[PDB]
Amino acid sequence: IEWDEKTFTKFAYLSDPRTRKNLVAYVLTKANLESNKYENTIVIENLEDGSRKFIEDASMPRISPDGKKIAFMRFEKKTAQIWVADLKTLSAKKVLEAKNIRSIEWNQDSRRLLAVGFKRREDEDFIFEDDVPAWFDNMGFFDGEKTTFWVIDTEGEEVIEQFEKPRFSSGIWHGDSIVVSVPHRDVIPRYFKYWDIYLWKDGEEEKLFEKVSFYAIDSDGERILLYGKPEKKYVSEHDKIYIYDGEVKGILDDIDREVAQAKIRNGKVYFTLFEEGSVNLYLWDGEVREIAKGKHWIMGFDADERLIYLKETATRPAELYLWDGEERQLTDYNGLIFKKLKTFEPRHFRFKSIDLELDGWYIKPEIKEGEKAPVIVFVHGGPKGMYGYYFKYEMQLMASKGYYIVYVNPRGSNGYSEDFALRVLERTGLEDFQDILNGIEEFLRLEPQADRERIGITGISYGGYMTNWALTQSDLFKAGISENGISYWLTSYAFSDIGLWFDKEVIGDNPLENENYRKLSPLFYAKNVKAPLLLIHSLEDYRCPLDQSLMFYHVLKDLGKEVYIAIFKKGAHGHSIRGSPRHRMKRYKLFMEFFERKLKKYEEGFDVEKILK
Amino acid sequence: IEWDEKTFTKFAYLSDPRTRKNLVAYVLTKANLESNKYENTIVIENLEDGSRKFIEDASMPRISPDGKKIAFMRFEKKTAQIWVADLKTLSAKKVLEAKNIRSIEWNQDSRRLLAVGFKRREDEDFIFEDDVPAWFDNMGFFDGEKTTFWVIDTEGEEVIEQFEKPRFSSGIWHGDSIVVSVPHRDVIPRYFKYWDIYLWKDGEEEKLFEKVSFYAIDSDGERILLYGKPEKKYVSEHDKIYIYDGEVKGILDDIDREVAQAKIRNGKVYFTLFEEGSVNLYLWDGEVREIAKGKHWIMGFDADERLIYLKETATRPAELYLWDGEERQLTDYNGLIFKKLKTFEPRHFRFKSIDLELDGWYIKPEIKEGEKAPVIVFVHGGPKGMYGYYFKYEMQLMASKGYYIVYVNPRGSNGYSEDFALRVLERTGLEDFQDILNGIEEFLRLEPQADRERIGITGISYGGYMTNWALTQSDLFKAGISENGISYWLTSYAFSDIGLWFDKEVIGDNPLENENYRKLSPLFYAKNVKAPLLLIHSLEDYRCPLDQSLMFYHVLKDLGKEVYIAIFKKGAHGHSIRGSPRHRMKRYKLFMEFFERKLKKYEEGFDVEKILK
Amino acid sequence: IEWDEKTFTKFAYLSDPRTRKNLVAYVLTKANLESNKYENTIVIENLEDGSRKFIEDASMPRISPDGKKIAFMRFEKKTAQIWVADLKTLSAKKVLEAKNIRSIEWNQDSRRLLAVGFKRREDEDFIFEDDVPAWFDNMGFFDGEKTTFWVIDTEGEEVIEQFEKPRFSSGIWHGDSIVVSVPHRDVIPRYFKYWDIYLWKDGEEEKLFEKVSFYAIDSDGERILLYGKPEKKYVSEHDKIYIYDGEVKGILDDIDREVAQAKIRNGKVYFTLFEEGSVNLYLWDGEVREIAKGKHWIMGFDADERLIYLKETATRPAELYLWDGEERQLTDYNGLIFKKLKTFEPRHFRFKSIDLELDGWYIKPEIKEGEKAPVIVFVHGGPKGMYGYYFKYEMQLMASKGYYIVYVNPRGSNGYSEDFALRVLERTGLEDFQDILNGIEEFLRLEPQADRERIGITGISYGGYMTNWALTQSDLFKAGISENGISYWLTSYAFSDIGLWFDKEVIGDNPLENENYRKLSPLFYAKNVKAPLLLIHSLEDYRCPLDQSLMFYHVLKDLGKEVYIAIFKKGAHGHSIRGSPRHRMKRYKLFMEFFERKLKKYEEGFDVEKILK
Ligand SMILES: [Cl-]
Ligand SMILES: [Cl-]
Ligand SMILES: [Cl-]
Ligand SMILES: [Mg+2]
Ligand SMILES: [Mg+2]
Ligand SMILES: [Mg+2]
Ligand SMILES: [Mg+2]
Ligand SMILES: [Mg+2]
Ligand SMILES: [Mg+2]
Ligand SMILES: [Mg+2]
Ligand SMILES: [Mg+2]
Ligand SMILES: [Mg+2]
Ligand SMILES: [Mg+2]
Ligand SMILES: [Mg+2]
Ligand SMILES: [Mg+2]
Ligand SMILES: [Mg+2]
Ligand SMILES: [Mg+2]
Ligand SMILES: [Mg+2]
């Protein structure tokens, strides 16, 4: 095993942990480069033996409350199928052939499933829209989408109740009722901001909440768990969790950090928080108790009789763990790979920027006492993203190729106070960019072997914006790779999936008259660019549509700049990690070669035919 | 036969007339709604009998100079094939299997073909671009495209010479040499503005012209025919024609009208001009002589021993004609259809607008002396398009459904003086929009049965811009249909295929700082809209990309307006006429029903599922 | 070449002669046993050279009036296609893709075609009927069928007018009008008995005739040719022909024979008559003139500038001939085959039966002066069929295998006086059966080498009835082969396609109370059968449905008789001649082996697995 553009295929990727009784289930995913497909296997472990059994070419494991059965999905006919297996022998029957189903959940009776899906107009030749937005990242054109809710009897194998709601509605069981969360409608739907919440049973409903900034995420049959706030002024405010049983009770009213995920089982709540680069696991049982806190990201968890969770670190993809008073590692899927593959632990540093003290990290490559090394600055997305202790392939890969890697959490990031997150609103490219510069300055001080004359910068999404911006506002950088970014806020407002509300918040109100939409946009400062730039974009990214890269590309070419554009024919906003294996391999090889040829040692041109094959 | 959304399928569509000796060849096209395909048949007529023979599932007829053979193209394997047939018996052999060939032309020897095509990078997963623009309407993503030139021996069936040039190059035979026209390169290629022209033979070339605003279109073996000007300041200047034999000689130096098409055969030049709504055919033989001038559009022509041409009118698709001193109609393909299908001849009117007198037309529907009728205003594209005497399906169709149809040639249109065309530059939405208003005002004066309270407006491309604009600047209109339009000039500049140079000319220089890019853009005046609007767009339109409709749609919805968007999944800028038959049928039915339900008699909503099926 | 069950595949089968000017077209059909398909080739002969050209995998040749073009049909998609070719080079275009088209005819303009076809309900799971009958032989279940009429422009390639009529309507051109013949409706449609005739043009019609017993068959643009009678009491009456130009004029009022086919060209009528075993060709030009009269059947003919016809004989399939004052044979397709294959000319004899003198024929096999030979009696269908001088494969084949063949025209047959035909009505199995017995008795007198102890009998349809009947009413016969017959008239009345009207005529009125329906039915006399019988039936025979064979089979088995049944899975009433080649081969081999094993020399059983392979 060596680091290159294919190494990501050698890892086992775990997701969707579930537990009932003495059993754990989860999904093992492999990127198969030869077939160009992801392969999914459900693994069921019996904590009684450490014994494993399998359900092949399947995902979405849902263990029935009684622990007797497992439901799952399989995906010729472009149709999904819901299956049920007995957990003892894993013999299985097909229950329903289920196109456009997004979720499945058991009722407490271990007989009925709730499935939530969607339906669209589906004309062969044209999409027709009369609501907003017209598209959504990783979903496609809405085409008049409505949400569908089906109650499925797994014994008789029939939809026994069904109903529809507006697009982007969700539903959970609450005993024998269904809690339904629907975006609230004003001039447009208030997506990610306000919901109406209903209690549905037997074809009738009652409204529980009107225009609240939380939605229902879980239930234990007596109490409903709510996620968000009673009322947000900004979508960027920290989401919290509340127990509802008649009265709404905050259980983290005093903790100024955002909840990543949360579940309730038997009146206890298990939850994770974004905290200064980590995603940490806690329990609330009347008080908040630490379960798994460290330099790591708790990516998923479940609890029933046992508590299990997936923990990723800066140098290892997720593995599964069990907590019984102390943490026990359950799986070691990548252990043999990693015995042969060098990894680089980031070094944390603090630095001052303006009025704040912030977190940065860096990775130092294998160099000897007399040598200097080039530097890649990475900028995370969001702006309310967060770097720290998750596994970032490009950083390990570039470190292995002789680069320093440097990255910080500027104001606007998740993982800190709410106020720290909100500082970025209407200030994109201002103090946050200064924080990145100040982090780099401190890093250079700490590492005199870092070659100040060969610093590059890269990022995706907000990180792509900031790469664009950096090359227009500073002469520090020798090369840039900007991916799925922003060059012009006004088109983000009006063209992107979330722009109508999110740009109002992050950039400002009255967008057609607000000067900040030009003032804080890289497009308008294109003349300033002096460093070679690679723009990467994908055709199904509706979060940051194509214009954001292609306009910047054309305008930079109109100004005589050295710029290149790679337009991946498939893929949404997250394609760098969710595209097809072969697509992702080609992106990684482009990324590494652009920095080899423009940053480590500049050479003219970029003959992609030669460089890639 | 009745008028509705399918009637366009009942017509025979003729194109690509060719003549050598006593023979005429042309292509008969049918839109087959059931198969959802266009069918192409070459027809060869012998003017000796009016006898016809056929080459089925074929196009691009090219008769050899000696009149003995015909080359043609056919299109399983996504591959084009070049074939040669003997003209006596039409027995035929396949010569070359020819993906991405755009043109075929015989050498004077009746043995060699010149084929011009293209080649691209072709990676399965990503497009890579390092030139400009990254895409072109009706061509796709360039993906590093180069032009390819092949000399093909039709006897031995081999490419005997080949070479490449930059994208958007063209080539013609000139005796045993090839005249090669290549876009001139400054900071970017000067597309539609400057070319370098070379004379190529046997792998060597000499430059004939450098940075000239014409390219080579034809040759008679002694003289080269050039199209354009020696130097244009604006691409919008009238294109003229010149004979080159050592010296460049203008042959229309005194005629202030633009050439539509031109050919040279035996030192005579045949050409058409855009003239006040007509496209008229002339000959130059030392002086300019009228051949076919009237209320018509000469869509294509060829000349050798005989002169033939295709003539379309306001009420008939093209038919073929021969001129031998007087015009004789040769074909009557749609004669039986039109005996059963009512058509409406437009009435021409003049009107004053500001400082000018302009041409308008209108069609009056079957109404009786006591009734009033709604009105649809059509606006042509361009801005240097031209309405008048070609067959416009929607106008006939809507007239048949009880609507007045009104349309003018505002300043900026083709068909008048050069200065009249150039008036629009930096003034889009200003005097030209006034011309449209003044035309409507005169039409209403002329037709008191026209219901001033039910006037709608529609257009495609620049006509879509002007529909957008009209609904933002006037309260006259009750409904709009805007197709493949412009809402924001700055994104047209930076995102569209031609924007980097064409918007500079039509909107203005320094686009990132020029206030006219906001001042003359409908997007910024969305709050003003009061009339229901249907936006139509297609996903392969790179001339006016999607943002132009979808941004306007989202912003109008953000402002609480009644607006709808139809996004056709396939189709370039011209999809209303070049999309698949079923696609076009669905567009026509949407178009007619939106006006039925919003203009003739307003009703709420637009249930496209119900309205269309 | 030898006689056996495959020999029929070695012949060329000609049909559908057409002539315009100096050209003749016709269809050459081959039975391909290996592919199990019929192959059809149009042959065009130029009487100028005896030169031939071809249109492969095509039929229904229709030469345009101007002689410039030929329309034809071709039949993957279960769709028929209408094509047009230039007759000079035979280059061809597809004009219309034409499922369920039954006929095509040119207008006098050589531009428009009239196509007549049908349309049905077409539900995948069930046929639904509310008219009568529910099915028709060689057509299938009607499923609510209506007749469709399309006028097709072959230039523009469009249906320019269309209309529908009740099932079993027909249409011809009459100049620029269409003459439409529709079955007249009383309690049910009066199929084969009364029609209403209309003149149709441009979507309007006028009734020409009401409830008449003729329909329109041809026109020369001035006069309409009508076929039938002004009023028939019996459908079995001889059909005659009449010219209509305002007045209806009989042109064969004095000739007591039935017209087989007739055409009008330039006010002359060419027609054939059924005459004492021959089908003979005449002309009427004011008087009736003999053209081709002899021991033959004129199977088809056409006339324009030249007169051509297909002539079959007892020993040769049809060949083409031209008449220019004398008959010239044009084709000799089977001439080489027949040089090697022995044939047997029938010997005509007269005999007395009751009150009449009748025609019989027999064929004597190669036997020497001391030997006797078995005898097969063949009975033709109808009852108004006719034996004589057409090519009957089974007779030649059995003669070659050492059998006498004997066959007569009993009363009821075509080819004689009308009264002779009508004698059979209400008398089936009575005097007609006596005529067959008396013919056999005279034949035995004429041929003492005919073995009276080994006489068998066979027939199809009415001939199958009479085979059934003979075995129940006589002890003369040693074996029978009854095919697609009648055993019970009452089920013929109520189940068959034509029974509701035809059985009323041939058997009698008031069928539910008329004793003749039992008295003249073989089923009721099954106990009498002593000779082995093979019943052959086919599953798509709606003229004589399955019950007619299977009931007789079951009842004979219930009575302990030696009987066998072969049920061909496909095939209509005429399957012995129109079934697939392999189907027909297997029938011929069954037929010959049953007589070998039951008639020539009786052996027990019939092991069809062994006997056939
Ligand atoms: Cl079950
Ligand atoms: Cl050749
Ligand atoms: Cl034609
Ligand atoms: Mg692998
Ligand atoms: Mg099942
Ligand atoms: Mg869809
Ligand atoms: Mg949040
Ligand atoms: Mg605060
Ligand atoms: Mg059609
Ligand atoms: Mg070849
Ligand atoms: Mg490609
Ligand atoms: Mg021009
Ligand atoms: Mg001027
Ligand atoms: Mg054969
Ligand atoms: Mg066709
Ligand atoms: Mg059917
Ligand atoms: Mg008859
Ligand atoms: Mg009589």
Side-chain angles (χ1 to χ4, degrees), chain A residues 227 232 235-239 258-259 384 414:
Chain A
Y227 185 86
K232 281 186 167 178
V235 171
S236 304
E237 288 171 50
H238 284 344
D239 292 297
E258 180 162 67
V259 176
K384 201 182 178 189
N414 217 341

mmCIF file of all heavy atoms in Angstrom, chain A residues 227 232 235-239 258-259 384 414, ligand 7:
data_model
loop_
_atom_site.group_PDB
_atom_site.id
_atom_site.type_symbol
_atom_site.label_atom_id
_atom_site.label_comp_id
_atom_site.label_asym_id
_atom_site.label_seq_id
_atom_site.Cartn_x
_atom_site.Cartn_y
_atom_site.Cartn_z
ATOM 1 N N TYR A 227 -35.156 19.263 17.711
ATOM 2 C CA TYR A 227 -33.835 19.751 17.286
ATOM 3 C C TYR A 227 -33.920 21.085 16.678
ATOM 4 O O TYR A 227 -34.620 21.247 15.659
ATOM 5 C CB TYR A 227 -33.235 18.760 16.270
ATOM 6 C CG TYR A 227 -31.810 19.127 15.866
ATOM 7 C CD1 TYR A 227 -30.677 18.709 16.612
ATOM 8 C CD2 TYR A 227 -31.603 19.836 14.702
ATOM 9 C CE1 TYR A 227 -29.392 19.070 16.218
ATOM 10 C CE2 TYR A 227 -30.350 20.155 14.271
ATOM 11 C CZ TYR A 227 -29.234 19.773 15.046
ATOM 12 O OH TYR A 227 -27.944 20.091 14.589
ATOM 13 N N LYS A 232 -35.336 30.929 16.037
ATOM 14 C CA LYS A 232 -33.999 31.410 15.580
ATOM 15 C C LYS A 232 -34.160 32.704 14.882
ATOM 16 O O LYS A 232 -35.120 32.919 14.132
ATOM 17 C CB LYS A 232 -33.393 30.419 14.550
ATOM 18 C CG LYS A 232 -32.805 29.208 15.228
ATOM 19 C CD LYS A 232 -32.127 28.407 14.130
ATOM 20 C CE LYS A 232 -31.248 27.345 14.558
ATOM 21 N NZ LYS A 232 -30.674 26.590 13.412
ATOM 22 N N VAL A 235 -30.269 31.144 10.920
ATOM 23 C CA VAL A 235 -30.200 29.703 10.761
ATOM 24 C C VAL A 235 -28.879 29.251 11.348
ATOM 25 O O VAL A 235 -28.728 28.147 11.886
ATOM 26 C CB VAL A 235 -30.310 29.383 9.262
ATOM 27 C CG1 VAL A 235 -30.018 27.936 9.021
ATOM 28 C CG2 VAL A 235 -31.761 29.708 8.786
ATOM 29 N N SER A 236 -27.874 30.135 11.258
ATOM 30 C CA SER A 236 -26.498 29.847 11.806
ATOM 31 C C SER A 236 -26.388 29.740 13.325
ATOM 32 O O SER A 236 -25.296 29.383 13.810
ATOM 33 C CB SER A 236 -25.496 30.868 11.293
ATOM 34 O OG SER A 236 -25.491 30.895 9.799
ATOM 35 N N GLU A 237 -27.416 30.128 14.067
ATOM 36 C CA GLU A 237 -27.441 29.916 15.522
ATOM 37 C C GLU A 237 -27.237 28.452 15.842
ATOM 38 O O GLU A 237 -27.653 27.603 15.035
ATOM 39 C CB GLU A 237 -28.755 30.451 16.160
ATOM 40 C CG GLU A 237 -28.885 31.932 16.238
ATOM 41 C CD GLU A 237 -30.349 32.227 16.687
ATOM 42 O OE1 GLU A 237 -30.812 31.632 17.702
ATOM 43 O OE2 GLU A 237 -30.844 33.160 16.188
ATOM 44 N N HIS A 238 -26.649 28.147 17.011
ATOM 45 C CA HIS A 238 -26.437 26.798 17.391
ATOM 46 C C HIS A 238 -27.736 26.079 17.555
ATOM 47 O O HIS A 238 -28.528 26.490 18.442
ATOM 48 C CB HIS A 238 -25.608 26.732 18.656
ATOM 49 C CG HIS A 238 -24.103 27.017 18.485
ATOM 50 N ND1 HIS A 238 -23.428 27.001 17.260
ATOM 51 C CD2 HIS A 238 -23.164 27.339 19.441
ATOM 52 C CE1 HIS A 238 -22.121 27.223 17.499
ATOM 53 N NE2 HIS A 238 -21.945 27.425 18.832
ATOM 54 N N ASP A 239 -27.899 24.972 16.862
ATOM 55 C CA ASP A 239 -29.006 24.028 17.175
ATOM 56 C C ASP A 239 -28.840 23.304 18.437
ATOM 57 O O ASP A 239 -27.742 22.843 18.784
ATOM 58 C CB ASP A 239 -29.192 23.061 16.043
ATOM 59 C CG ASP A 239 -29.716 23.759 14.819
ATOM 60 O OD1 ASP A 239 -30.813 24.292 14.829
ATOM 61 O OD2 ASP A 239 -28.970 24.008 13.855
ATOM 62 N N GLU A 258 -23.065 23.648 19.560
ATOM 63 C CA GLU A 258 -24.121 23.101 18.706
ATOM 64 C C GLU A 258 -24.173 21.551 18.809
ATOM 65 O O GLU A 258 -23.122 20.871 18.755
ATOM 66 C CB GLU A 258 -23.865 23.502 17.297
ATOM 67 C CG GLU A 258 -24.953 22.938 16.350
ATOM 68 C CD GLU A 258 -25.000 23.651 15.012
ATOM 69 O OE1 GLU A 258 -24.071 23.567 14.213
ATOM 70 O OE2 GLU A 258 -26.076 24.237 14.788
ATOM 71 N N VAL A 259 -25.364 20.989 18.852
ATOM 72 C CA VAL A 259 -25.620 19.537 18.767
ATOM 73 C C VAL A 259 -25.496 19.083 17.320
ATOM 74 O O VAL A 259 -26.057 19.640 16.367
ATOM 75 C CB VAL A 259 -27.006 19.127 19.388
ATOM 76 C CG1 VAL A 259 -27.283 17.602 19.188
ATOM 77 C CG2 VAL A 259 -27.117 19.516 20.878
ATOM 78 N N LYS A 384 -19.896 27.871 8.477
ATOM 79 C CA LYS A 384 -19.986 27.182 9.781
ATOM 80 C C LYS A 384 -19.659 25.659 9.616
ATOM 81 O O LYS A 384 -20.293 24.769 10.249
ATOM 82 C CB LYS A 384 -21.383 27.354 10.395
ATOM 83 C CG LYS A 384 -21.389 27.126 11.931
ATOM 84 C CD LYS A 384 -22.794 27.265 12.507
ATOM 85 C CE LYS A 384 -22.783 26.994 13.957
ATOM 86 N NZ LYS A 384 -24.165 26.906 14.585
ATOM 87 N N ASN A 414 -17.943 26.400 13.065
ATOM 88 C CA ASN A 414 -18.532 25.628 14.178
ATOM 89 C C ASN A 414 -17.521 25.201 15.188
ATOM 90 O O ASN A 414 -16.327 25.223 14.947
ATOM 91 C CB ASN A 414 -19.265 24.374 13.625
ATOM 92 C CG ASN A 414 -20.543 24.066 14.395
ATOM 93 O OD1 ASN A 414 -20.731 24.522 15.531
ATOM 94 N ND2 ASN A 414 -21.466 23.360 13.734
HETATM 95 MG MG MG D 7 -27.077 24.115 12.926
#
